[PDB]
């Protein structure tokens, strides 16, 4: 029984670490999206000129 519980805990820890690094990559993706929106604003400024 103790071995089973330990193995389950180890699996949970591994899942958490993987989720952490995926979250970091998501941060980067969202920053890139913001940059794209800024570029669109620049295009609009040129058209208005």
């Amino acid at each position: 029984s103790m071995a089973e519980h330990d193995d389950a805990d180890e699996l949970t820890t591994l899942l958490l670490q993987q989720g952490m690094e995926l979250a970091t990559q998501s941060i980067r993706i969202q920053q890139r999206t913001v940059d794209e929106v800024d570029a669109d604003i620049a295009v609009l400024a040129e058209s208005r000129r």
């Binding site: 071995a3 089973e4 180890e10 699996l11």
Partner: protein, 49 residues
Amino acid sequence: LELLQRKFTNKALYSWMRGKLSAIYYQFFDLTQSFCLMAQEALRRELTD
């Protein structure tokens, strides 16, 4: 998946464990039935029926 395969309680451990238990159960059932039969014979002798 790789972590799951290297677990202490992997598939092989459970398979061997339940196979050994199945063999033990199979023999123990015969032993217990023989014991119950001799107990019934003792009761029959006691009641003379």
